[PDB]
Scaffold this motif. Structure first.
Motif: not given
Ligand SMILES: *[C@@H]1O[C@H](CO)[C@@H](O[C@@H]2O[C@H](CO)[C@@H](O[C@@H]3O[C@H](CO[C@H]4O[C@H](CO)[C@@H](O)[C@H](O[C@H]5O[C@H](CO)[C@@H](O)[C@H](O)[C@@H]5O[C@H]5O[C@H](CO)[C@@H](O)[C@H](O)[C@@H]5O)[C@@H]4O)[C@@H](O)[C@H](O[C@H]4O[C@H](CO)[C@@H](O)[C@H](O)[C@@H]4O[C@H]4O[C@H](CO)[C@@H](O)[C@H](O)[C@@H]4O)[C@@H]3O)[C@H](O)[C@H]2NC(C)=O)[C@H](O)[C@H]1NC(C)=O
Ligand SMILES: *[C@@H]1O[C@H](CO)[C@@H](O[C@@H]2O[C@H](CO)[C@@H](O[C@@H]3O[C@H](CO[C@H]4O[C@H](CO)[C@@H](O)[C@H](O[C@H]5O[C@H](CO)[C@@H](O)[C@H](O)[C@@H]5O)[C@@H]4O)[C@@H](O)[C@H](O[C@H]4O[C@H](CO)[C@@H](O)[C@H](O)[C@@H]4O[C@H]4O[C@H](CO)[C@@H](O)[C@H](O)[C@@H]4O)[C@@H]3O)[C@H](O)[C@H]2NC(C)=O)[C@H](O)[C@H]1NC(C)=O
Ligand SMILES: *[C@@H]1O[C@H](CO)[C@@H](O[C@@H]2O[C@H](CO)[C@@H](O[C@@H]3O[C@H](CO[C@H]4O[C@H](CO[C@H]5O[C@H](CO)[C@@H](O)[C@H](O)[C@@H]5O)[C@@H](O)[C@H](O[C@H]5O[C@H](CO)[C@@H](O)[C@H](O)[C@@H]5O)[C@@H]4O)[C@@H](O)[C@H](O[C@H]4O[C@H](CO)[C@@H](O)[C@H](O)[C@@H]4O)[C@@H]3O)[C@H](O)[C@H]2NC(C)=O)[C@H](O)[C@H]1NC(C)=O
Ligand SMILES: *[C@@H]1O[C@H](CO)[C@@H](O[C@@H]2O[C@H](CO)[C@@H](O[C@@H]3O[C@H](CO[C@H]4O[C@H](CO)[C@@H](O)[C@H](O)[C@@H]4O)[C@@H](O)[C@H](O[C@H]4O[C@H](CO)[C@@H](O)[C@H](O)[C@@H]4O[C@H]4O[C@H](CO)[C@@H](O)[C@H](O)[C@@H]4O)[C@@H]3O)[C@H](O)[C@H]2NC(C)=O)[C@H](O)[C@H]1NC(C)=O
Ligand SMILES: *[C@@H]1O[C@H](CO)[C@@H](O[C@@H]2O[C@H](CO)[C@@H](O[C@@H]3O[C@H](CO[C@H]4O[C@H](CO)[C@@H](O)[C@H](O)[C@@H]4O)[C@@H](O)[C@H](O[C@H]4O[C@H](CO)[C@@H](O)[C@H](O)[C@@H]4O[C@H]4O[C@H](CO)[C@@H](O)[C@H](O)[C@@H]4O)[C@@H]3O)[C@H](O)[C@H]2NC(C)=O)[C@H](O)[C@H]1NC(C)=O
Ligand SMILES: *[C@@H]1O[C@H](CO)[C@@H](O[C@@H]2O[C@H](CO)[C@@H](O[C@@H]3O[C@H](CO[C@H]4O[C@H](CO[C@H]5O[C@H](CO)[C@@H](O)[C@H](O)[C@@H]5O[C@H]5O[C@H](CO)[C@@H](O)[C@H](O)[C@@H]5O)[C@@H](O)[C@H](O)[C@@H]4O)[C@@H](O)[C@H](O)[C@@H]3O)[C@H](O)[C@H]2NC(C)=O)[C@H](O)[C@H]1NC(C)=O
Ligand SMILES: *[C@@H]1O[C@H](CO)[C@@H](O[C@@H]2O[C@H](CO)[C@@H](O[C@@H]3O[C@H](CO[C@H]4O[C@H](CO)[C@@H](O)[C@H](O)[C@@H]4O)[C@@H](O)[C@H](O[C@H]4O[C@H](CO)[C@@H](O)[C@H](O)[C@@H]4O)[C@@H]3O)[C@H](O)[C@H]2NC(C)=O)[C@H](O)[C@H]1NC(C)=O
Ligand SMILES: *[C@@H]1O[C@H](CO)[C@@H](O)[C@H](O)[C@H]1NC(C)=O
Ligand SMILES: *[C@@H]1O[C@H](CO)[C@@H](O)[C@H](O)[C@H]1NC(C)=O
Ligand SMILES: *[C@@H]1O[C@H](CO)[C@@H](O)[C@H](O)[C@H]1NC(C)=O
Ligand SMILES: *[C@@H]1O[C@H](CO)[C@@H](O)[C@H](O)[C@H]1NC(C)=O
Ligand SMILES: *[C@@H]1O[C@H](CO)[C@@H](O)[C@H](O)[C@H]1NC(C)=O
Lengths: 126, 213, 97, 242, 269, 126
Positions: D110, C12-14, A89-90, A16, A11-13, C58, A85
């Motif tokens: 996006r 943060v998802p990483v 993605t992160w 997210a 998902s986009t930052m 995704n 943003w």
């Protein structure tokens, strides 16, 4: 809506940065095998505390999102707001800023103690 | 079209120039977003601005835009030479689609001219083996991009077999156009001379040849 | 506005690729097996009654099963687990005759 | 970010159909929209529609509602952030007005208010809706000629005098020499047939050391031609240089 | 986190589109067995044939079945156990009288299904070696009993089943069962043992187990010569292959939650 | 300038109160030997948390410098400002106030909960 732990991976930052309290949540609680359990149980609190350590030596014990006083060196990224943003993605974003994250952290470290050493002077005079 | 651009605008080098993009309330401009493109003829376009003021990645600060409640515009500064081209805008929102305007050509001036590099190639021995007879008048490297190709035949102009074309911007900001014409193969050793005139504003050029080969 | 400022994010998802000590899980029927028989089912933590695996939409991930650890870890866990079981079990030293 | 190559040109007689493909590389195909815009002469530029490779959502104009269908293929990945997908566009009926250029172009962001905005474009695909049959390009050489007898300059190239329809390639020796890459557009004959030439600047001294092969093709009907220019000159000014 | 490739056509290496995080893996039981691997989880659509380097013969091939092929195994003899007092506390479990007939240990698989499933692997194999190719099956070349034969446990005793009957075929471009004999040991030396061994006590009575075959560990012959007749043979040896066979879906990652990025925001004074 | 972990040992309590974020930094992250590692790994988080424990049962989770509402009993030190901040070192200073540090801490403990029990009443009425 509620995706799940790590659900906003692709998902986009911005999107997210909504689900932050979910990744922050599932991060603590959840003789051969007995030893495995023990050096996994300490590893999880060591790894966790090392982040709180950073948030605390900055001003961001809040936490989640925390603004600061160190300005963004364009050399680090230089991309526009929208395209990070509402675009990146992160997972992706992490690899760009990865080259200077520890240098960035150092800017933060001095800046916080600088705040404290200053704020004492305010309460001192007032 | 419904979205009304301007016809053409002008400006010097290291100068500034604007261009309108007006329309009716059904298309522009209240409660509506506007884009801006640099679309060279016969080549892929390039996105400059979006959401009225937001500049795309790889866009010099000089380019700017503003949407009034009744009309949208685009302003270009520090005019470089390659900015001499055709531009388009488009009305759009999140869910709907794009609506291109009418069209505007940019005419940058304060720009030095150029002497044309003319090189005429006559028909080869293999070409006549059909039989078909023509010529190949070519002209390159000139400014401004406008010329007129004329011919002659025994103290009088040519009233048949003409196929003239338009100029076009090149890889080095110059312009080049071509021109051909057909003659009968029995008009070689029978007819004396023939002119291939191509006039320009700065100076005049031509490639005359008499069939005796 | 032009001037941007870094703001830190927590949660943060990483992830970075890793190696670490994992741990075992088994079910209640394995302990109901009793008879002091199954290896390491006892020291092994239980499973989940309602397991959940969150699909990550995704995202793509570069797997390689020939350069994995948790199979080397497992292979090892199995050899150890087994070898610890034989310590109490009787030695057939004099059967060599 | 990544390139967006497309199918070649083709002719189709009126009252028929067509399908234009467009491959993806260097970016996540599913992460952005795919738009399709035409540079037809009559109405100028015009946006057909777009489709999301992810969701499959289509938004076409009324002009292309009953007439066209958007198509999208499966994404096959290169890395975690890169892929290789493709998209198409089936126009059902064919009119006189459809004769013109066609482009595919991916979305801007996006997420946001400008998600589908065509940012990155393809190199273009051509269509000539016409009742006329295909004509091969009759190729011929050009007798070498000079520009300045004093400056030390010469020039030579290939000629393509009669064909239909456009466009045509302009390569040299399997894409070897990247010097003096020049070309002129075609001009239409009074009957309805095109005609073009091409030239490249070269020095006089070299004759036999240089190899002339303009490996040029005309794809609408699968035609391949190769030609070589001979040293027989035309203008006296070139032979003085030697 | 553990990340799970949910793609139903994945060869184990490269980008996986369908992915999921998960705490624990699935129920991976430790079947330690050579040649054919048993009772494992099977593929969802196609019989996937996975390898590190397929072109190189030195690397084995991990075949994962699509359909289970049930293989019944047994020790027909009603064996008896007596206990011998080594003393004190020590007590050896001897093998006593054999009650009844003296028969031979063996395993049965359907010749029909083996035919069917060996046809599936060939359809898949030709995707790597050419459409116009011969792919026949041969028995072990030679080595230790640990690897020259389908080894497993069954009821508490260890089996060594001749696989010559299974790998004995030939495949062109275009109702009983398979009785296969076995041997049995008690002093075993598994996992390449060197200083220690283990005596598996006699298991009293008659023994029989029923299991599915989930996969194979095949090996191609490197003689080559560009011949369209490259044959295959069953292998084993390294036991990591078995866990490699079940753990191909999984990968372990280190979570790093501290993101830093610019947004137009300054902290207060 | 950057001295190093403990570098301001023999520095004045003013100059040493600058480099606080350096001592606070190198304080967490950094089968015979195997056990040594484990009861050292827990010892470090136990010892660390016991300080955060105090800062938290006071109001000083900030942290570094934190002012309070318990006034300085002259009996504890009675020295003037200059001669401790621009003179004495923390090694030295620690041994003077050492006799009452736990008594001082108790004054802090009651004072914080007293703040909270009060601040609820403010947000209650407003
Ligand atoms: C691939 O997977 C397959 C499928 O799992 C594997 O097959 C397994 O093989 C095993 C052998 O390798 C086999 O285990 C043996 O089974 C023997 C048969 O008896 C059991 O099974 C029947 C049904 O088949 C069952 O009816 C029996 O008892 C039931 O009822 C009693 C109560 O009366 C319960 O206590 C018991 O749990 C069971 O309950 C069932 O019924 C109730 C309803 O009544 C249901 O509600 C339940 O859910 C449940 O279904 C037997 O359980 C059996 O004789 C063997 O027993 C020995 O070994 C076990 C080891 O745990 C030990 O506990 C026993 O006491 C005994 O050992 C000791 O006693 C001997 C003398 O008694 C002595 O000589 C020994 O030295 C010991 O001292 C053993 O349990 C297993 O059953 C099958 N799987 C299935 C599903 O049947 C296959 O092996 C796999 N492949 C590979 C390569 O591994
Ligand atoms: C590895 O091992 C597994 C098992 O460990 C093998 O798989 C097994 O294969 C056998 C056959 O090879 C399967 O047995 C089949 O069972 C069918 C269903 O029978 C049940 O239903 C009927 C009603 O329809 C009941 O009457 C039966 O009960 C009666 O029989 C039992 C003994 O079987 C008695 O103890 C009872 O008291 C009853 O009297 C069962 O509950 C069955 O239909 C099938 O064939 C029967 O029918 C055909 C005609 O179509 C007959 O020719 C044949 O002789 C059978 O006749 C039985 O059933 C009739 C009634 O239908 C009775 O009247 C007869 O007296 C006779 O009992 C067959 O018997 C078994 O299910 C299956 N198990 C599993 C788990 O898969 C693998 O093959 C093996 N593989 C390898 C490679 O080795
Ligand atoms: C995985 O990645 C992909 C790709 O990166 C990503 O998909 C993108 O998701 C974003 C959202 O985060 C999308 O951007 C949004 O698009 C919204 C579209 O609005 C509506 O209208 C669409 C077009 O309809 C036109 O045409 C029809 C018929 O022609 C006509 O009837 C209409 O009136 C209109 O003219 C339509 O396609 C779209 O449909 C979606 O939603 C409906 C329900 O509403 C659902 O039924 C569909 O199945 C489909 O999901 C929709 O109806 C747009 O509104 C939105 O704008 C909002 O946000 C911005 C800020 O972001 C605000 O400024 C604005 O005011 C709005 O509030 C935004 O632009 C983007 O288009 C996707 N891109 C692609 C390629 O798919 C996934 O989300 C990712 N997933 C994960 C888990 O990471
Ligand atoms: C894994 O499994 C494989 C395959 O099962 C196994 O390979 C086989 O090993 C055995 C030895 O253990 C090989 O030995 C065979 O044994 C049989 C049994 O002997 C009986 O019959 C003979 C007479 O036939 C009697 O003398 C004896 O006392 C027994 O009663 C033999 O029959 C085999 O001999 C055949 O070949 C001889 C030489 O050609 C002939 O003279 C003989 O007549 C037999 O007939 C064959 O030849 C005929 C023409 O002459 C032909 O018409 C027949 O159809 C037939 O082909 C033989 O001695 C056995 O050959 C091996 N199998 C194969 C396919 O090679 C592995 O050993 C096992 N793994 C391990 C580790 O052991
Ligand atoms: C793996 O699985 C296979 C089955 O898929 C199994 O193979 C079986 O092998 C045995 C032999 O051990 C087969 O039994 C016979 O084999 C002979 C071999 O003859 C060859 O060798 C002789 C020299 O010794 C040559 O002269 C001859 O030309 C051959 O090259 C076969 O000849 C036998 O078949 C004959 O009879 C059939 C029935 O009438 C005829 O249809 C057939 O055409 C054959 O006649 C031919 O030979 C005659 C002389 O013998 C000649 O006069 C005729 O004109 C004609 O040319 C017979 O097959 C057994 O059949 C095989 N099984 C099957 C299903 O075919 C392996 O044992 C197995 N291995 C393991 C380890 O499990
Ligand atoms: C050795 O090999 C044997 C096999 O020989 C193995 O035994 C087998 O093991 C499996 C897994 O443990 C067992 O399967 C279970 O089946 C349960 C079924 O109950 C559910 O499904 C019902 C039907 O649902 C179908 O229809 C719906 C529409 O409403 C679909 O959405 C759904 O997807 C299903 O369609 C699927 O199946 C049909 C065929 O039925 C296909 O045609 C379709 O294409 C599609 O694939 C449903 O009504 C019900 O409400 C349930 O939801 C399931 O719950 C459970 O999780 C598990 O999958 C076998 O039962 C078992 N068989 C035997 C004979 O033992 C053995 O495990 C293996 N190992 C060993 C050691 O022996
Ligand atoms: C799956 O496995 C196969 C092999 O089984 C791999 O295929 C080979 O791929 C390599 C390239 O990746 C091919 O190239 C060969 O490399 C050899 C390297 O060996 C030299 O270098 C090492 C370095 O330590 C030395 O120790 C060694 O002594 C050698 O000096 C070359 O030797 C090969 O020959 C070349 O060099 C010699 C001179 O040494 C010349 O005479 C030859 O003409 C030639 O120029 C060659 O370059 C190799 O050919 C491939 N072999 C096969 C059978 O395909 C696959 O790459 C692998 N798959 C994956 C995904 O990794
Ligand atoms: C940070 O930005 C300044 C200008 O804004 C630049 O001079 C400097 O080089 C940048 N930092 C780095 C490390 O490049
Ligand atoms: C980023 O976008 C803003 C939008 O107003 C624009 O002003 C700015 O110039 C852009 N920056 C770059 C580097 O394009
Ligand atoms: C597979 O089964 C068929 C069934 O008749 C049999 O004839 C065939 O020989 C079998 N395959 C091989 C390779 O033998
Ligand atoms: C082999 O041929 C079949 C014929 O149906 C085809 O489907 C398959 O894709 C081919 N595979 C390869 C690897 O050529
Ligand atoms: C604290 O100071 C007061 C006077 O300021 C004094 O009476 C008292 O004794 C001091 N406390 C101690 C413990 O001596």
């Amino acid at each position: 809506v509620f995706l799940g732990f790590l659900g906003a991976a692709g998902s986009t930052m911005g999107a997210a940065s909504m689900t932050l309290t979910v990744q922050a949540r599932n991060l603590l609680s959840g003789t051969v095998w007995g030893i495995k359990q023990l050096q996994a149980r300490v590893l999880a609190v060591e790894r966790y505390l090392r982040d709180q350590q950073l948030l605390g030596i900055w001003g961001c014990s809040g936490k989640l999102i925390c603004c600061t006083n160190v300005p963004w060196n364009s050399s680090w990224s230089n991309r526009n707001l929208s395209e990070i943003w509402d675009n990146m993605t992160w997972l992706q974003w992490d690899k760009e800023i990865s080259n200077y994250t520890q240098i960035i952290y150092g800017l933060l470290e001095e800046s916080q103690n600088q705040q404290e050493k200053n704020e004492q002077d305010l309460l001192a005079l007032d | 079209s419904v979205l009304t651009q301007s016809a053409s605008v002008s400006g010097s080098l290291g100068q500034s120039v604007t261009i309108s993009c007006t329309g009716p309330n059904s298309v522009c401009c209240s409660h509506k977003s506007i884009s801006w493109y640099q679309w060279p003829p016969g080549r892929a376009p390039t996105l400059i601005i979006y959401e009225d003021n937001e500049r795309a990645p790889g866009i010099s600060p000089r380019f700017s835009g503003y949407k009034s409640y009744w009309s949208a515009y685009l302003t270009i500064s520090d005019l470089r030479p390659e900015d001499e081209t055709t531009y388009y805008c488009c009305s759009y929102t999140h869910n709907s689609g794009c609506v291109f305007g009418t069209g505007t050509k940019v005419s940058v001036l304060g720009q030095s001219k150029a002497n044309p590099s003319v090189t005429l190639f006559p028909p080869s021995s293999e070409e006549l083996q059909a039989n078909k007879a023509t010529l190949v008048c070519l002209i390159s490297d000139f400014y401004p991009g406008a010329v007129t190709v004329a011919w002659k035949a025994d103290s009088s102009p040519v009233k048949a077999g003409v196929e003239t074309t338009t100029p076009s911007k090149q890889s080095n900001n110059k312009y080049a156009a071509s021109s051909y014409l057909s003659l009968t193969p029995e008009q070689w050793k029978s007819h004396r001379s023939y002119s291939c005139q191509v006039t320009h504003e700065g100076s005049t050029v031509e490639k005359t040849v008499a069939p005796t080969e | 506005a032009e001037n941007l400022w870094v703001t830190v994010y927590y949660g943060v998802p990483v992830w970075k690729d890793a190696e670490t000590t994992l741990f075992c899980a088994s079910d209640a029927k394995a302990y109901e097996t009793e008879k002091h028989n199954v290896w390491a089912t006892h020291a092994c933590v239980p499973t989940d009654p309602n397991p959940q695996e969150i699909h990550l939409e995704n995202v793509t991930e570069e797997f390689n099963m020939w350069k994995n650890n948790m199979v080397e870890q497992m292979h090892t866990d199995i050899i150890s687990l087994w070898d610890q079981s034989l310590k109490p079990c009787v030695k057939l030293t004099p059967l060599c005759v | 970010q990544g390139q967006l190559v497309q199918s070649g040109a083709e002719l189709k007689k009126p009252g028929a159909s067509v399908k234009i493909s467009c491959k993806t590389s260097g970016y996540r195909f599913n992460f952005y929209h795919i738009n399709w815009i035409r540079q037809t002469a009559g109405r100028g530029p015009e946006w057909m529609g777009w489709i999301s490779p992810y969701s499959g959502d289509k938004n076409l104009a009324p002009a292309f509602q009953d007439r066209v269908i958007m198509t999208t293929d499966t994404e096959v990945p290169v890395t975690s952030f890169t892929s290789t997908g493709a998209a198409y566009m089936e126009i059902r009926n064919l009119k006189f007005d459809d004769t013109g250029t066609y482009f595919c172009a991916k979305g801007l962001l996006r997420d946001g208010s400008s998600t589908w905005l065509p940012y990155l474009w393809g190199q273009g695909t051509l269509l000539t809706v016409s009742s006329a049959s295909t004509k091969g390009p009759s190729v011929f050489p050009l007798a070498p000629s000079s520009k300045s007898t004093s400056g030390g300059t010469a020039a030579l190239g290939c000629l393509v005098k009669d064909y239909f329809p456009e466009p045509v390639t302009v390569s040299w020796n399997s894409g070897a020499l990247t010097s003096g890459v020049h070309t002129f557009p075609a001009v239409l004959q009074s009957s309805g047939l095109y005609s073009l030439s091409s030239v490249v600047t070269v020095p006089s001294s070299s004759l036999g050391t240089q190899t002339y092969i303009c490996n040029v093709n005309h794809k609408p009907s699968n035609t391949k031609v190769d030609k070589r220019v001979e040293p027989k000159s035309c203008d006296k000014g070139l032979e003085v240089l030697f | 986190a553990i990340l799970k490739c949910k793609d139903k056509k994945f060869n184990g290496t490269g980008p996986c589109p369908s992915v999921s995080t998960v705490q624990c893996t699935h129920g991976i039981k430790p079947v330690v067995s050579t040649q054919l691997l048993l009772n494992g989880s099977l593929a969802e659509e196609e019989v996937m044939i996975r390898s590190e380097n397929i072109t190189n013969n030195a690397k084995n091939i991990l075949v994962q079945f699509n359909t289970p092929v049930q293989i019944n195994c047994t020790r027909p003899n009603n064996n008896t156990r007596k206990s011998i007092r080594i003393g004190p506390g020590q007590a050896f479990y001897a093998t006593g009288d054999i009650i009844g007939d003296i028969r031979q240990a063996h395993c049965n698989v359907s010749k029909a299904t083996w035919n069917e499933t060996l046809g599936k692997v060939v359809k898949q194999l030709r995707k790597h070696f050419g459409n116009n190719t011969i792919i026949r099956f041969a028995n072990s070349s030679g080595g230790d009993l640990e690897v020259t034969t389908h080894s497993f446990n069954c009821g508490g005793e260890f089996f060594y089943c001749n696989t010559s009957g299974l790998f004995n075929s030939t495949w062109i471009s275009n109702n009983d069962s398979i009785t296969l004999p076995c041997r049995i040991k008690q002093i075993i030396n598994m996992w390449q043992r060197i200083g220690q061994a283990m005596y598996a006590p006699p298991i009293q009575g008659v023994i029989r187990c029923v299991s599915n075959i989930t996969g194979l560990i095949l090996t191609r012959d490197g003689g080559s010569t560009n011949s369209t007749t490259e044959t295959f043979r069953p292998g084993g040896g390294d036991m990591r292959d078995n866990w490699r066979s079940e753990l191909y879906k999984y990968k372990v990652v280190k979570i790093e939650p501290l993101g830093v990025a610019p947004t137009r925001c300054k902290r207060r004074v």
